[PDB]
Amino acid sequence: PGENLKHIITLGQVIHKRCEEMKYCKKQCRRLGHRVLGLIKPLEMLQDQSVPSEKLTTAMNRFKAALEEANGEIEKFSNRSNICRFLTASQDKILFKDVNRKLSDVWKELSLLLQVEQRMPVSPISQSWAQEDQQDADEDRRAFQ
Ligand SMILES: [Cl-]
């Protein structure tokens, strides 16, 4: 469990650094990196300190898989010609729509389990993504011309 947590933290840190380097569709890439860094922040605080339930282990594995899926999409979209093909085949122009929904859904479940089982604090503000994604997609579309 300690190794799984460390892996998730490292993977989130790598995704944020990669997002900051992406040359095209920067609003969407930077939003993904910002969101991922925000999710790993309480995990990093937890790491600096219980036996997980069945529900916690599966939530942790789903979160790890969603981050791996995001890392795979960042790799694909680092090449400009892959962005162009995706955008032309897309109606809403949102690069990370599926990855973003998986991350938000799993985080809702995972954060609650960490608060109940592992004494993770309840944050003054929880972690509107779909609406932000359309705005970012529109701004990136204009810059991609
Ligand atoms: Cl661009």
Residue numbers in the entry: 0 to 48, 52 to 129, 132 to 149
In the authors' words:
It gets activated through phosphorylation of Thr357 and Ser358 in its pseudokinase domain by RIP3 kinase and subsequently oligomerizes via its executioner domain and inserts into the membrane. To this end, displacement of the auto-inhibitory brace helix (α-helix 6) from the four-helix bundle is required, which depends on a specific composition of phospholipids in the membrane. Currently, two classes of compounds are reported to inhibit MLKL by covalently binding to Cys86 in the short α-helix 4 located on top of the four-helix bundle, which comprises α-helices 1, 2, 3, and 5.
Both structures of the unliganded four-helix bundle were highly similar (rmsd value 2.1 Å) and showed only minor differences from the two published NMR solution structures [NMR structure has an rmsd of 2.4 Å to 2MSV and an rmsd of 2.5 Å to 6D74 (12)]. The four-helix bundle was formed by α-helices 1, 2, 3, and 5 of MLKL with a short interjacent α-helix 4 on top. The subsequent α-helix 6 packed with multiple contacts, against the four-helix bundle. The unliganded MLKL executioner domain had a hydrodynamic radius of 19 Å, which is consistent with a monomer.
